[PDB]
RNA sequence: GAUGAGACGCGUUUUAGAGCUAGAAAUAGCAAGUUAAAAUAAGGCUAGUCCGUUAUCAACUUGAAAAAGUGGCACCGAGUCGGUGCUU
DNA sequence: CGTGATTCCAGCGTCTCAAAGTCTACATA
DNA sequence: TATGTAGACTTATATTGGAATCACG
């Protein structure tokens, strides 16, 4: 069996796979083809790509699920309201509710009278005339005290409940006083009454504007205080204003109180918190705080409710009535003005629904903004519309009762109006008095966020727990739901578990055990040196215990001075001590210990370990919740242990935040031999004092083994669940799953022989304004005038050379001279650290100079000469933030620090390793699926080595050796990327085996940086273990080791391993082999078929029409009378071979056609296909001939023409256009697809090659035409493209190449799309017929497409 | 970063808002114009203040199904694989 | 009168939860 | 009066199929 390797490239839209061998040549095999087709043997290369639709997020599903939940909860609330009214309404009217529930049906299908409210035309007309809107009726029922018909009361209550407004506002503000100025004046009056000796002059203070301004509460407080000279924000009046604004002011200082008078109107405890305050200073100040609360309510009402009428109790219904009156008056005035001045526009404005006039604003789809935009010029053109123009500029011209800006309405206003109606109508209806609080509860009820769906399971989003098994109603939710228990489950489920131990609950941030762990972990590294001691010593167990007892348990924060003096001098009698570790202040602290010591006032209780767990259960309660009532309910279990004062003080104490390590990770697991936990080791570890990092990484302890055994595949019940649990986007996880299945299929393909290596690469998944700001700040800090002489826009800064020029302030970075913009093309861009040490494209890693030769010494950093010349200039640029600290250090690396071997190792590590961890998870999954056997030492046998590569290495490999990629040519680039990843990974691990530790999971481990770095100049790689003095990693591939000086160090034609001596690269035939691989016209492109799901149809209720395409919104709602949905998305088509009656002849004519199965009908079709098809009209269906065709089903026609089944009546182009490599390279070079990076001589050679191969352009177009004539069959589009190409033959080569790059989408795989050749627009050619594929060859393709099943549909039947 | 929940305001739609006069009618002219109720993905069985737009995957065989099983190799070339040898 | 070509058109805004960043003014040494 | 700290305000586009329309030989 020949050894082979598998390379894969992972993306969010594609998975590229490639199989390589010992020659780095893609193999080729014969694959059997099943089916009735004549062909039984085919040939396919082992490199290809798999294309699937990107994974879609679940946010849309979450929104369209919460929407259904809300629209089923509102209906239930309305039903409850009806249930309250059932008996009395039935006494008054027996068919009122049936009318209201059958109002939507037409008169023909109605079982009752067509007039809902009264059942007769006369009373309906009278009601509508008397009450044009529901708001008139609501206001009448609020203010008027006369008995009214029960139907009107029910209608008002229903309209109030069904639209109750938001619940954002906190607290209770049922009183409707909202005039800011009047309540501010009353507060000032009360303050002056209480404080006569110290009055406040509020004259000239615009309280309304200041308090109601759209600004922060603190900002408004400061503004208001600024208008009071002798008053401060922290004063009593300032604290009252802050409380009114929603802050939390402390009245302790104002009244010299011992108790901290913290009062917030949002907190539920305020009712007590105020009274307690009134207990100390008396009840004389109560009226002041009540005036403050009234002012707060007025401020909260602010702009949303702005009507000012004293008589009306309802402050919102009168607002709607005033709006309606303004609308009517403005309509009459505008109608008169239009009839007088512009009679020709009257019909267009008041009758054309298609326009954005009044007709379209009322009956059409025109919104308020569109109507304003359409009518502003007409009002400005006419006379007498000054008030109308003012209203338009104030967004109150011809407004409707319902609008877009009623979302600010707090539910308190609707609650108050409903309360007023109930108070005004309960005097005539006993049941309203009996059920007033029930209706108020219905209106105010709202399922708390921490309770969740009231579903007792039977779902995958419910966590609520029940106290009694009965129906939950808004009136009994407190006693039928275990709210306290359910809140704990909520908090726990949406809080991440310990990363090290997925099954262990994490600890609170302020937990006592967690604080002990943090202190000890840090304490296990402190040392002390004195006169008598020869060497600094680790703090022993007894020493650490004494330090904790004397310092950490007596001071919240322990400073280094405190450690030196209070312990070493007081106990150890040490006069001079040096402390290792942190200096000045210790970051860790036992804040919780001192906090509990202050409350309970029982030090022995805290120091007793027996209470430890209990204390934890307290701290958890202080962290788990924030509601004081729930905290009290939980802490009630420990009420016997502490006094009531202590219990209340604990209730007032609250916390937040979580740690990162679990309790079991601290004191749960124990080492096998020692029998000590992590905390036990931290308290005493002899003279080693190993910390947590050392403890969990020590091979001599079981902690590491236990962590490895626990964390490994904690979700490893299967492959789907393990990938799903991984943290990452849905698209990337779908790509991971497809890559794993591709690996399994490839392993099956090659005779069940595991490949030697698996290389994986995962693709990497405004700014001009930022650049402008940075350049402006740097120039203004530097004081230069370069912007005055050279204006520039933000977009122009996207050019690298111009951006670097402005960053350097028009000065050469290596020479103390100026640079010219118009000469930038003759200048040079040079890397500070050369390519020999680090291949990169970072802006900081680049410098704009007149000539690179001026860099002085080039072997190791720019010479000390340039540093001495312009280190001050570099520092000046650094201070202006024009260059970064890293760039400055690299520029001054000549003598800031000698060229470091550590820096070279860091460069190598940065180039090699992968910063992301998701790639590590993918590698672990692949390794666990491949490596399953163990050796004699019970260690894993790593038959398959999994390598992870970054895209930078492959991109640089592509750029160095003229192997270019153009993503918009075809989809082969994914497969080519996978192949190059495989080649690069295999070659890199064969050249330098020691890199396996960096590139493989587990087993192999690093040793140091000394053995990696070689000696100066060329060294013997084979003899000396030294591998690389220069810090490049891929320069062995190329034929010349370049340098910043331009010096050349040629390499042997054949590169081989130093020790083993095996040939790893033959530059004379391996590059040719790669070229031949990339030139292969046959590549396995298979689109992953995926049955479509989602919306039943487009979500837009279309108006009634005479067409069968409409889909009914309800079973009995005929689309011809009530409209319905349109465009049902087809889940998958079904090929049916049956007969249908031929109309009048009544003959069963044999037919074969594609029937689109919609998502709506999918379940019915799958339940019984025969009955569904017979209902559709087909007779004598061949059940065994039924073929399921999901979306993207592949069909082949004559001359290799391929199509994909996009739907039942539309097709997509199914062929790939394999362009020759030379044309691809010419298009890449000529169009400047990427930046023109490289030596100027190389750029000149590339330009010469482009100019000498201009004819390619024509040839390319010719090829495309032929491909169209072979695959596209779009005569009009092809002719237009040819005419456009012949039209712009005089255009520059770069522009023509760029247009051709975006001209390639004519035959791109997938759905057709319109494109632009220069200014010519070519629309997509759509294949609206699927008849031909009924006689083509259906090709079912595997995930890799190496196995294919070809069925001749024409041969069937 | 990945989820998950509780709320709102809309939007859309049919019917209700006797639209009128002069026309034989078509048509003309005139008046009014904001609101309401209902559904908001077909509905299902588990009858829930639940759930239905994310995740799954080619075909066949075995199977209800979670799933397993089902295809030679080398060689030269290369327009989306063509042929040769070997195995067979 | 099928048939190719042309055109439009698609449901959408807000808040809360729960998170840290950062000032800040009353304790605190 | 120079810090510690507890609190509290602040921050956190196009795609593509369907349907109609529209010419049209």
mmCIF file with all atom_site columns, C-alpha atoms (C1' of nucleotides) in Angstrom, chain A residues 44-45 56 58 61 64-65 68-71 73 75-76 80 100 103 114 128 162 164-165 324 327-328 335 339 350-351 358 400-404 445 447 456 458-459 461 474 720 737-738 741 748 752 972 1080-1081 1091 1093-1094 1096 1099 1101 1104 1113 1115 1216 1218 1263 1347, chain B residues 1-18 29-43 46-59 67 69-84:
data_model
loop_
_atom_site.group_PDB
_atom_site.id
_atom_site.type_symbol
_atom_site.label_atom_id
_atom_site.label_alt_id
_atom_site.label_comp_id
_atom_site.label_asym_id
_atom_site.label_entity_id
_atom_site.label_seq_id
_atom_site.pdbx_PDB_ins_code
_atom_site.Cartn_x
_atom_site.Cartn_y
_atom_site.Cartn_z
_atom_site.occupancy
_atom_site.B_iso_or_equiv
_atom_site.pdbx_formal_charge
_atom_site.auth_seq_id
_atom_site.auth_comp_id
_atom_site.auth_asym_id
_atom_site.auth_atom_id
_atom_site.pdbx_PDB_model_num
ATOM 1   C CA    . UNK A 1 44   ? -11.384 11.504 -11.061 1.00 0.00 ? 44   UNK A CA    1
ATOM 2   C CA    . UNK A 1 45   ? -8.449  13.209 -9.402  1.00 0.00 ? 45   UNK A CA    1
ATOM 3   C CA    . UNK A 1 56   ? -27.504 30.397 9.260   1.00 0.00 ? 56   UNK A CA    1
ATOM 4   C CA    . UNK A 1 58   ? -30.670 30.994 15.079  1.00 0.00 ? 58   UNK A CA    1
ATOM 5   C CA    . UNK A 1 61   ? -35.773 31.590 14.721  1.00 0.00 ? 61   UNK A CA    1
ATOM 6   C CA    . UNK A 1 64   ? -40.027 34.442 15.146  1.00 0.00 ? 64   UNK A CA    1
ATOM 7   C CA    . UNK A 1 65   ? -40.546 32.234 18.205  1.00 0.00 ? 65   UNK A CA    1
ATOM 8   C CA    . UNK A 1 68   ? -45.491 33.683 18.315  1.00 0.00 ? 68   UNK A CA    1
ATOM 9   C CA    . UNK A 1 69   ? -45.282 33.440 22.097  1.00 0.00 ? 69   UNK A CA    1
ATOM 10  C CA    . UNK A 1 70   ? -46.301 37.096 22.507  1.00 0.00 ? 70   UNK A CA    1
ATOM 11  C CA    . UNK A 1 71   ? -49.100 36.874 19.932  1.00 0.00 ? 71   UNK A CA    1
ATOM 12  C CA    . UNK A 1 73   ? -50.151 35.489 25.207  1.00 0.00 ? 73   UNK A CA    1
ATOM 13  C CA    . UNK A 1 75   ? -54.886 36.672 22.816  1.00 0.00 ? 75   UNK A CA    1
ATOM 14  C CA    . UNK A 1 76   ? -55.033 34.758 26.102  1.00 0.00 ? 76   UNK A CA    1
ATOM 15  C CA    . UNK A 1 80   ? -59.352 36.235 30.254  1.00 0.00 ? 80   UNK A CA    1
ATOM 16  C CA    . UNK A 1 100  ? -66.408 40.411 17.636  1.00 0.00 ? 100  UNK A CA    1
ATOM 17  C CA    . UNK A 1 103  ? -65.837 40.282 12.392  1.00 0.00 ? 103  UNK A CA    1
ATOM 18  C CA    . UNK A 1 114  ? -72.665 42.425 10.030  1.00 0.00 ? 114  UNK A CA    1
ATOM 19  C CA    . UNK A 1 128  ? -69.235 56.138 15.198  1.00 0.00 ? 128  UNK A CA    1
ATOM 20  C CA    . UNK A 1 162  ? -54.482 44.572 24.246  1.00 0.00 ? 162  UNK A CA    1
ATOM 21  C CA    . UNK A 1 164  ? -50.757 48.287 27.360  1.00 0.00 ? 164  UNK A CA    1
ATOM 22  C CA    . UNK A 1 165  ? -47.478 50.058 26.538  1.00 0.00 ? 165  UNK A CA    1
ATOM 23  C CA    . UNK A 1 324  ? -57.302 64.294 15.968  1.00 0.00 ? 324  UNK A CA    1
ATOM 24  C CA    . UNK A 1 327  ? -55.484 66.734 12.038  1.00 0.00 ? 327  UNK A CA    1
ATOM 25  C CA    . UNK A 1 328  ? -59.049 67.684 11.095  1.00 0.00 ? 328  UNK A CA    1
ATOM 26  C CA    . UNK A 1 335  ? -58.022 71.334 1.328   1.00 0.00 ? 335  UNK A CA    1
ATOM 27  C CA    . UNK A 1 339  ? -58.510 74.208 -4.014  1.00 0.00 ? 339  UNK A CA    1
ATOM 28  C CA    . UNK A 1 350  ? -56.095 63.195 -1.984  1.00 0.00 ? 350  UNK A CA    1
ATOM 29  C CA    . UNK A 1 351  ? -56.965 60.290 -4.323  1.00 0.00 ? 351  UNK A CA    1
ATOM 30  C CA    . UNK A 1 358  ? -52.618 62.148 1.803   1.00 0.00 ? 358  UNK A CA    1
ATOM 31  C CA    . UNK A 1 400  ? -52.488 59.655 13.132  1.00 0.00 ? 400  UNK A CA    1
ATOM 32  C CA    . UNK A 1 401  ? -53.752 58.353 16.477  1.00 0.00 ? 401  UNK A CA    1
ATOM 33  C CA    . UNK A 1 402  ? -51.455 55.303 16.091  1.00 0.00 ? 402  UNK A CA    1
ATOM 34  C CA    . UNK A 1 403  ? -47.854 56.205 15.211  1.00 0.00 ? 403  UNK A CA    1
ATOM 35  C CA    . UNK A 1 404  ? -44.253 54.998 15.342  1.00 0.00 ? 404  UNK A CA    1
ATOM 36  C CA    . UNK A 1 445  ? -49.040 41.168 34.914  1.00 0.00 ? 445  UNK A CA    1
ATOM 37  C CA    . UNK A 1 447  ? -43.915 36.971 33.416  1.00 0.00 ? 447  UNK A CA    1
ATOM 38  C CA    . UNK A 1 456  ? -43.560 22.446 32.610  1.00 0.00 ? 456  UNK A CA    1
ATOM 39  C CA    . UNK A 1 458  ? -42.263 19.678 26.992  1.00 0.00 ? 458  UNK A CA    1
ATOM 40  C CA    . UNK A 1 459  ? -39.750 21.965 25.253  1.00 0.00 ? 459  UNK A CA    1
ATOM 41  C CA    . UNK A 1 461  ? -36.252 26.422 26.567  1.00 0.00 ? 461  UNK A CA    1
ATOM 42  C CA    . UNK A 1 474  ? -52.095 36.092 36.209  1.00 0.00 ? 474  UNK A CA    1
ATOM 43  C CA    . UNK A 1 720  ? -22.627 15.927 16.034  1.00 0.00 ? 720  UNK A CA    1
ATOM 44  C CA    . UNK A 1 737  ? -18.692 18.705 10.599  1.00 0.00 ? 737  UNK A CA    1
ATOM 45  C CA    . UNK A 1 738  ? -18.419 18.573 6.810   1.00 0.00 ? 738  UNK A CA    1
ATOM 46  C CA    . UNK A 1 741  ? -17.204 13.606 7.258   1.00 0.00 ? 741  UNK A CA    1
ATOM 47  C CA    . UNK A 1 748  ? -12.826 4.884  3.184   1.00 0.00 ? 748  UNK A CA    1
ATOM 48  C CA    . UNK A 1 752  ? -9.149  1.875  4.853   1.00 0.00 ? 752  UNK A CA    1
ATOM 49  C CA    . UNK A 1 972  ? -11.043 25.379 -7.554  1.00 0.00 ? 972  UNK A CA    1
ATOM 50  C CA    . UNK A 1 1080 ? -5.551  19.732 -14.014 1.00 0.00 ? 1080 UNK A CA    1
ATOM 51  C CA    . UNK A 1 1081 ? -8.864  20.627 -15.705 1.00 0.00 ? 1081 UNK A CA    1
ATOM 52  C CA    . UNK A 1 1091 ? -33.268 20.015 1.711   1.00 0.00 ? 1091 UNK A CA    1
ATOM 53  C CA    . UNK A 1 1093 ? -36.410 24.587 5.336   1.00 0.00 ? 1093 UNK A CA    1
ATOM 54  C CA    . UNK A 1 1094 ? -37.638 27.808 6.881   1.00 0.00 ? 1094 UNK A CA    1
ATOM 55  C CA    . UNK A 1 1096 ? -43.646 28.565 4.627   1.00 0.00 ? 1096 UNK A CA    1
ATOM 56  C CA    . UNK A 1 1099 ? -44.214 37.081 4.954   1.00 0.00 ? 1099 UNK A CA    1
ATOM 57  C CA    . UNK A 1 1101 ? -50.212 39.351 3.223   1.00 0.00 ? 1101 UNK A CA    1
ATOM 58  C CA    . UNK A 1 1104 ? -57.359 39.701 -2.705  1.00 0.00 ? 1104 UNK A CA    1
ATOM 59  C CA    . UNK A 1 1113 ? -53.938 32.398 5.893   1.00 0.00 ? 1113 UNK A CA    1
ATOM 60  C CA    . UNK A 1 1115 ? -58.393 26.911 6.600   1.00 0.00 ? 1115 UNK A CA    1
ATOM 61  C CA    . UNK A 1 1216 ? -17.158 25.017 -13.763 1.00 0.00 ? 1216 UNK A CA    1
ATOM 62  C CA    . UNK A 1 1218 ? -11.372 25.621 -15.729 1.00 0.00 ? 1218 UNK A CA    1
ATOM 63  C CA    . UNK A 1 1263 ? -12.625 30.939 -24.525 1.00 0.00 ? 1263 UNK A CA    1
ATOM 64  C CA    . UNK A 1 1347 ? -18.583 7.988  -5.746  1.00 0.00 ? 1347 UNK A CA    1
ATOM 65  C "C1'" . G   B 2 1    ? -17.648 35.513 21.693  1.00 0.00 ? 1    G   B "C1'" 1
ATOM 66  C "C1'" . A   B 2 2    ? -21.818 31.725 21.562  1.00 0.00 ? 2    A   B "C1'" 1
ATOM 67  C "C1'" . U   B 2 3    ? -26.603 31.336 23.057  1.00 0.00 ? 3    U   B "C1'" 1
ATOM 68  C "C1'" . G   B 2 4    ? -31.724 32.031 25.899  1.00 0.00 ? 4    G   B "C1'" 1
ATOM 69  C "C1'" . A   B 2 5    ? -35.735 34.493 27.862  1.00 0.00 ? 5    A   B "C1'" 1
ATOM 70  C "C1'" . G   B 2 6    ? -39.672 38.793 29.080  1.00 0.00 ? 6    G   B "C1'" 1
ATOM 71  C "C1'" . A   B 2 7    ? -41.706 42.959 27.222  1.00 0.00 ? 7    A   B "C1'" 1
ATOM 72  C "C1'" . C   B 2 8    ? -43.428 47.243 23.126  1.00 0.00 ? 8    C   B "C1'" 1
ATOM 73  C "C1'" . G   B 2 9    ? -44.548 49.977 19.176  1.00 0.00 ? 9    G   B "C1'" 1
ATOM 74  C "C1'" . C   B 2 10   ? -45.596 49.148 14.416  1.00 0.00 ? 10   C   B "C1'" 1
ATOM 75  C "C1'" . G   B 2 11   ? -46.524 47.005 9.382   1.00 0.00 ? 11   G   B "C1'" 1
ATOM 76  C "C1'" . U   B 2 12   ? -49.890 44.029 6.579   1.00 0.00 ? 12   U   B "C1'" 1
ATOM 77  C "C1'" . U   B 2 13   ? -54.725 42.357 5.496   1.00 0.00 ? 13   U   B "C1'" 1
ATOM 78  C "C1'" . U   B 2 14   ? -60.996 41.679 5.168   1.00 0.00 ? 14   U   B "C1'" 1
ATOM 79  C "C1'" . U   B 2 15   ? -65.316 43.746 7.233   1.00 0.00 ? 15   U   B "C1'" 1
ATOM 80  C "C1'" . A   B 2 16   ? -67.386 47.905 9.991   1.00 0.00 ? 16   A   B "C1'" 1
ATOM 81  C "C1'" . G   B 2 17   ? -67.588 52.798 9.480   1.00 0.00 ? 17   G   B "C1'" 1
ATOM 82  C "C1'" . A   B 2 18   ? -75.543 53.847 5.222   1.00 0.00 ? 18   A   B "C1'" 1
ATOM 83  C "C1'" . G   B 2 29   ? -68.806 67.023 -10.005 1.00 0.00 ? 29   G   B "C1'" 1
ATOM 84  C "C1'" . C   B 2 30   ? -68.790 67.161 -4.676  1.00 0.00 ? 30   C   B "C1'" 1
ATOM 85  C "C1'" . A   B 2 31   ? -68.177 65.394 0.569   1.00 0.00 ? 31   A   B "C1'" 1
ATOM 86  C "C1'" . A   B 2 32   ? -65.491 62.337 4.007   1.00 0.00 ? 32   A   B "C1'" 1
ATOM 87  C "C1'" . G   B 2 33   ? -60.721 60.722 5.092   1.00 0.00 ? 33   G   B "C1'" 1
ATOM 88  C "C1'" . U   B 2 34   ? -57.025 59.390 10.896  1.00 0.00 ? 34   U   B "C1'" 1
ATOM 89  C "C1'" . U   B 2 35   ? -60.347 54.711 13.869  1.00 0.00 ? 35   U   B "C1'" 1
ATOM 90  C "C1'" . A   B 2 36   ? -62.037 49.755 15.173  1.00 0.00 ? 36   A   B "C1'" 1
ATOM 91  C "C1'" . A   B 2 37   ? -62.460 44.073 15.793  1.00 0.00 ? 37   A   B "C1'" 1
ATOM 92  C "C1'" . A   B 2 38   ? -59.662 39.474 13.980  1.00 0.00 ? 38   A   B "C1'" 1
ATOM 93  C "C1'" . A   B 2 39   ? -55.104 36.622 12.140  1.00 0.00 ? 39   A   B "C1'" 1
ATOM 94  C "C1'" . U   B 2 40   ? -50.286 37.294 12.039  1.00 0.00 ? 40   U   B "C1'" 1
ATOM 95  C "C1'" . A   B 2 41   ? -46.096 32.063 9.571   1.00 0.00 ? 41   A   B "C1'" 1
ATOM 96  C "C1'" . A   B 2 42   ? -50.614 26.122 7.288   1.00 0.00 ? 42   A   B "C1'" 1
ATOM 97  C "C1'" . G   B 2 43   ? -51.451 23.652 12.682  1.00 0.00 ? 43   G   B "C1'" 1
ATOM 98  C "C1'" . U   B 2 46   ? -48.341 16.307 24.445  1.00 0.00 ? 46   U   B "C1'" 1
ATOM 99  C "C1'" . A   B 2 47   ? -53.979 20.079 25.440  1.00 0.00 ? 47   A   B "C1'" 1
ATOM 100 C "C1'" . G   B 2 48   ? -49.299 23.152 27.504  1.00 0.00 ? 48   G   B "C1'" 1
ATOM 101 C "C1'" . U   B 2 49   ? -50.013 31.359 29.064  1.00 0.00 ? 49   U   B "C1'" 1
ATOM 102 C "C1'" . C   B 2 50   ? -46.614 24.393 25.116  1.00 0.00 ? 50   C   B "C1'" 1
ATOM 103 C "C1'" . C   B 2 51   ? -44.513 23.771 20.334  1.00 0.00 ? 51   C   B "C1'" 1
ATOM 104 C "C1'" . G   B 2 52   ? -43.744 24.805 14.418  1.00 0.00 ? 52   G   B "C1'" 1
ATOM 105 C "C1'" . U   B 2 53   ? -37.949 29.568 10.275  1.00 0.00 ? 53   U   B "C1'" 1
ATOM 106 C "C1'" . U   B 2 54   ? -31.662 27.331 14.000  1.00 0.00 ? 54   U   B "C1'" 1
ATOM 107 C "C1'" . A   B 2 55   ? -28.952 22.052 13.909  1.00 0.00 ? 55   A   B "C1'" 1
ATOM 108 C "C1'" . U   B 2 56   ? -29.426 17.018 10.105  1.00 0.00 ? 56   U   B "C1'" 1
ATOM 109 C "C1'" . C   B 2 57   ? -27.984 14.669 5.044   1.00 0.00 ? 57   C   B "C1'" 1
ATOM 110 C "C1'" . A   B 2 58   ? -26.119 12.099 -1.712  1.00 0.00 ? 58   A   B "C1'" 1
ATOM 111 C "C1'" . A   B 2 59   ? -27.948 6.813  -3.780  1.00 0.00 ? 59   A   B "C1'" 1
ATOM 112 C "C1'" . A   B 2 67   ? -27.027 3.638  12.785  1.00 0.00 ? 67   A   B "C1'" 1
ATOM 113 C "C1'" . G   B 2 69   ? -22.608 -1.953 5.499   1.00 0.00 ? 69   G   B "C1'" 1
ATOM 114 C "C1'" . U   B 2 70   ? -22.098 -1.508 0.143   1.00 0.00 ? 70   U   B "C1'" 1
ATOM 115 C "C1'" . G   B 2 71   ? -16.734 0.584  -4.937  1.00 0.00 ? 71   G   B "C1'" 1
ATOM 116 C "C1'" . G   B 2 72   ? -9.312  -3.227 -7.454  1.00 0.00 ? 72   G   B "C1'" 1
ATOM 117 C "C1'" . C   B 2 73   ? -3.771  -1.266 -8.427  1.00 0.00 ? 73   C   B "C1'" 1
ATOM 118 C "C1'" . A   B 2 74   ? 0.200   0.589  -11.350 1.00 0.00 ? 74   A   B "C1'" 1
ATOM 119 C "C1'" . C   B 2 75   ? 1.563   3.485  -15.812 1.00 0.00 ? 75   C   B "C1'" 1
ATOM 120 C "C1'" . C   B 2 76   ? 1.622   7.403  -19.608 1.00 0.00 ? 76   C   B "C1'" 1
ATOM 121 C "C1'" . G   B 2 77   ? -0.517  11.342 -20.920 1.00 0.00 ? 77   G   B "C1'" 1
ATOM 122 C "C1'" . A   B 2 78   ? -4.947  15.796 -19.675 1.00 0.00 ? 78   A   B "C1'" 1
ATOM 123 C "C1'" . G   B 2 79   ? -10.665 20.817 -21.627 1.00 0.00 ? 79   G   B "C1'" 1
ATOM 124 C "C1'" . U   B 2 80   ? -13.943 18.936 -16.300 1.00 0.00 ? 80   U   B "C1'" 1
ATOM 125 C "C1'" . C   B 2 81   ? -10.727 12.344 -17.824 1.00 0.00 ? 81   C   B "C1'" 1
ATOM 126 C "C1'" . G   B 2 82   ? -8.623  9.324  -22.017 1.00 0.00 ? 82   G   B "C1'" 1
ATOM 127 C "C1'" . G   B 2 83   ? -6.205  5.203  -22.857 1.00 0.00 ? 83   G   B "C1'" 1
ATOM 128 C "C1'" . U   B 2 84   ? -2.547  1.033  -21.678 1.00 0.00 ? 84   U   B "C1'" 1
#
